[PDB]
């Protein structure tokens, strides 16, 4: 802890934007594909949330080809690269798992707006 | 489940070889008073490690 946390505070990336259990964010992660190594983006909605130092995640809900998908990113993972926000929203909660049963009109979340 | 043979009075004694009681390793006394009290806690009236807590 006192010896550790150093090897963490030494790894932890300081290049990370704000967040919220309602924001959209567009995580841009690597891919490698085959012989290439592009940068895949992930447009979703933060439901769960990190906060554990070097170890941290956001868990984003997307719902691609008519099928709901959920991904848990490791914030300080070199494969995370960048991470936008796109849209922040008002939730009034810390974990929006009550969204795994919503969909359009019901899954709607009023934007943040300050 | 019951005994098949009446346990000799000897066997009984051996079983009670660990039942023996323990002394007290000698108890301490107080400074302010000659209180022959137990180690770490209040004397017969209100003393302990010198001083004198607990009114009367």
């Amino acid at each position: 802890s006192n010896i550790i946390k150093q090897l963490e505070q030494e790894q932890m990336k300081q290049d990370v934007p704000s967040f919220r259990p309602g924001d959209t964010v567009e995580v841009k992660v690597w891919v490698v594909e085959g012989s290439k190594k592009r940068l895949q983006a992930f447009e979703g909605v933060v439901i769960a949330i990190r906060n554990r130092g070097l170890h941290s995640a956001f868990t984003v809900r997307k719902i691609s080809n008519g099928e709901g998908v959920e991904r848990v990113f490791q914030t300080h993972s070199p494969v995370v690269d960048s991470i936008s926000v796109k849209r922040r929203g008002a939730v009034r909660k810390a974990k929006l798992y009550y969204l795994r049963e919503r969909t359009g009109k019901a899954a709607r979340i009023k934007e943040r707006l300050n | 489940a019951v005994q098949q043979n009446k346990p000799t009075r000897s066997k009984r004694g051996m079983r009670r070889s660990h039942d023996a009681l323990t002394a007290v390793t000698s108890l301490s006394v107080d400074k302010t008073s000659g209180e022959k009290h137990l180690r770490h806690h209040i004397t017969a009236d209100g003393y302990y490690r010198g001083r004198k807590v607990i009114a009367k």
Binding site: - | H40, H41, I42, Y48, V53, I54
Partner: protein, 120 residues
């Protein structure tokens, strides 16, 4: 396994093991001295100090919150006003235990929980 688990359950449901301390707490804040069980004492300890530490500030919420726990506007008054300033400088150890143990009915070990500044 209890590995690294804090808190003593004594021998009852949290429900009970809350008000029994809530009473024993205000009880201490009152007579400033009590003769309870050693374990039941080294417990009441980290239940009143947090209250006194809370009594450090007059406030108007820490007062209500002080009323939340220990439902006694009587003692909440004793706190903030008395023990409040009484230990306004006290680091943290506002209690003593003064052992004695050995009760009649039960060989249970008793103890003398008391505010550090109780002697007059």
């Amino acid at each position: 396994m209890r590995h690294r688990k804090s808190g003593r359950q004594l021998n009852r449901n949290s429900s009970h093991r809350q008000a029994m301390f809530r009473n024993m707490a205000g009880s201490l804040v009152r007579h400033e001295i009590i003769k309870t069980t050693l374990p039941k004492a080294k417990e009441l300890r980290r239940v009143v100090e947090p209250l006194i530490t809370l009594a450090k500030t007059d406030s108007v919420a820490n007062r209500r919150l002080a009323f939340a726990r220990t439902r006694d506007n009587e003692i909440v008054a004793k706190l903030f006003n008395e023990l409040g300033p009484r230990f306004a400088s006290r680091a943290g150890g506002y209690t003593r235990i003064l052992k004695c143990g050995f009760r009649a009915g039960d060989n249970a070990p008793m103890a003398y929980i008391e505010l550090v500044d109780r002697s007059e």
